[PDB]
Amino acid sequence: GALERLPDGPRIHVPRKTALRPTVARQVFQPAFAPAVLSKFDPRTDADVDEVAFSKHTSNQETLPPVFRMVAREYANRVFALLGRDNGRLSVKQALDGLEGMDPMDKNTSPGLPYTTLGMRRTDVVDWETATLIPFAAERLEKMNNKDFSDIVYQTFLKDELRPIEKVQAAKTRIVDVPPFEHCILGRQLLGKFASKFQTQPGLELGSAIGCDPDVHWTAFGVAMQGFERVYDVDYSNFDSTHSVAMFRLLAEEFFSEENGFDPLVKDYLESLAISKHAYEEKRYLITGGLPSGCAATSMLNTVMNNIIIRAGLYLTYKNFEFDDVKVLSYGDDLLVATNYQLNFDRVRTSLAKTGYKITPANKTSTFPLESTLEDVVFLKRKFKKEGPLYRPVMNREALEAMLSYYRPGTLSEKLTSITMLAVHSGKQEYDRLFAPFREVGVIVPTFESVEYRWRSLFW
Numbered sequence: 459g460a461l462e463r464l465p466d467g468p469r470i471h472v473p474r475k476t477a478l479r480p481t482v483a484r485q486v487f488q489p490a491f492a493p494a495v496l497s498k499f500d501p502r503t504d505a506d507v508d509e510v511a512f513s514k515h516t517s518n519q520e521t522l523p524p525v526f527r528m529v530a531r532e533y534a535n536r537v538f539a540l541l542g543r544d545n546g547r548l549s550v551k552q553a554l555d556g557l558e559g560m561d562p563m564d565k566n567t568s569p570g571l572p573y574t575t576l577g578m579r580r581t582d583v584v585d586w587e588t589a590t591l592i593p594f595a596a597e598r599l600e601k602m603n604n605k606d607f608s609d610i611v612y613q614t615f616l617k618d619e620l621r622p623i624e625k626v627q628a629a630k631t632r633i634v635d636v637p638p639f640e641h642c643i644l645g646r647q648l649l650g651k652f653a654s655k656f657q658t659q660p661g662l663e664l665g666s667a668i669g670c671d672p673d674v675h676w677t678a679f680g681v682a683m684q685g686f687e688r689v690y691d692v693d694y695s696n697f698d699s700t701h702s703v704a705m706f707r708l709l710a711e712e713f714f715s716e717e718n719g720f721d722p723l724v725k726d727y728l729e730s731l732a733i734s735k736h737a738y739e740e741k742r743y744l745i746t747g748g749l750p751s752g753c754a755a756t757s758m759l760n761t762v763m764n765n766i767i768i769r770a771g772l773y774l775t776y777k778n779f780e781f782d783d784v785k786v787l788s789y790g791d792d793l794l795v796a797t798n799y800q801l802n803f804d805r806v807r808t809s810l811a812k813t814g815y816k817i818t819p820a821n822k823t824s825t826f827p828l829e830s831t832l833e834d835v836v837f838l839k840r841k842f843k844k845e846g847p848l849y850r851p852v853m854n855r856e857a858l859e860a861m862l863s864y865y866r867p868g869t870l871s872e873k874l875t876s877i878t879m880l881a882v883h884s885g886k887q888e889y890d891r892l893f894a895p896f897r898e899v900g901v902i903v904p905t906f907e908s909v910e911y912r913w914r915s916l917f918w
Contacts, residue, residue, distance in 0.1 A: 460517050463741075474616075478493045479864065487860075511633055515745055523774065527708060532781055533665075545719045550643060554643070557654045560654040567580060568636045605723075610735065612735065613636040614636075616632070617631060635734075635751045649727075661678065662786070667789040667837070679837075686798060687798045688801075689795070691794060694793065700814050703732045705763060761789065761790055765786050767813075771806045772784060772806060789837075803819070803826035850883040861880075862893075886907075
């Protein structure tokens with residue numbers, strides 16, 4: 459919200475060509491999907507894609523009800539009771555290498571401005587052996603330690619991916635925000651030690667599916683939500699952008715605070731996300747509110763806010779409502795409510811509408827069903843398919859066809875390998891149907907029994 463125009467500067471090229479190309483299986487399945495619109499002169503749409511991206515960000519909420527604060531600090535108590543309040547700053551060595559049971563920073567990811575303009579990669583700007591930034595990058599990280607984030611400009615561009623034909627026709631393409639590499643390092647310094655603990659324990663108590671593995675953890679999520687009377691599926695609309703600047707303050711003061719064992723600089727880092735400066739072609743602008751993408755923190759941040767927001771809506775809608783009445787499971791804006799009560803999310807939608815957040819039923823029709831169970835819900839594009847004492851992540855049939863219909867030249871073998879581990883849960887008949895197009899044109903893929911056996915090996 460609140461997009462303020464700044465003085466224009468050097469041209470930072472937004473890419474306007476898809477790398478996606480159709481496979482041999484596109485003609486077979488013909489999914490309701492196509493590459494996202496990137497150019498203004500894309501003939502598949504009437505609309506200007508830059509206008510549609512800039513039409514969003516109207517204005518976030520200035521204020522926010524007082525119930526958001528108490529439910530935030532009450533959620534904080536539960537989280538830090540389990541994980542602990544030893545969430546101090548990590549060294550630059552620890553940030554790059556990552557802690558034990560935490561992936562190291564990706565060397566391939568974009569380094570951000572001005573390194574992308576100069577044609578440099580992440581491994582140019584730092585030495586991973588010694589954890590040593592080059593003089594230019596080192597002094598910028600120094601200034602951010604001294605409470606100054608004035609140099610930080612997000613490289614912003616359109617997301618190259620598949621979209622529904624309606625999103626392609628309407629030119630509604632998602633926006634990627636790439637922060638500078640030093641900003642991304644500093645983020646993992648301040649919030650890394652906490653993130654490592656949050657990743658390792660996904661479940662209903664922490665209220666998060668972050669750092670899970672659908673093959674294994676679906677059985678754990680399944681059995682945990684099994685005993686409950688109902689399970690609701692709730693989806694937000696523009697969850698990242700609708701975060702108010704007040705929400706960021708709440709997190710800094712109540713959740714990611716020095717009381718809970720965080721670095722004092724965390725507050726200033728969170729303000730860099732709250733009020734951020736972006737570069738798009740020659741345009742420069744300033745968005746007040748909403749969480750930018752980029753780096754590993756984004757999914758965790760939304761997961762924390764999601765547990766707060768959904769309960770705050772319930773507190774507002776349902777009087778004498780309890781915190782433990784609802785058990786939550788979420789991976790960012792993908793939300794899953796488990797409860798013994800009977801909740802009406804039509805009235806919760808109207809409550810949260812006033813607070814800025816917009817929920818939807820996730821079933822293409824404006825009616826949250828009063829009755830809903832574990833078998834009905836869809837979480838992470840997957841369903842909960844019980845099989846003996848286990849649960850299998852059965853992925854949507856229309857999703858699987860869409861994934862196989864397009865690809866990026868060069869990395870086709872890597873793609874097919876990963877999709878076999880998804881399609882295995884749909885059954886041998888469905889499995890061999892989905893890969894038949896590729897085998898038809900002389901492309902070998904592993905047997906169903908090979909990959910099905912591999913999945914069963916996880917539980918031995």
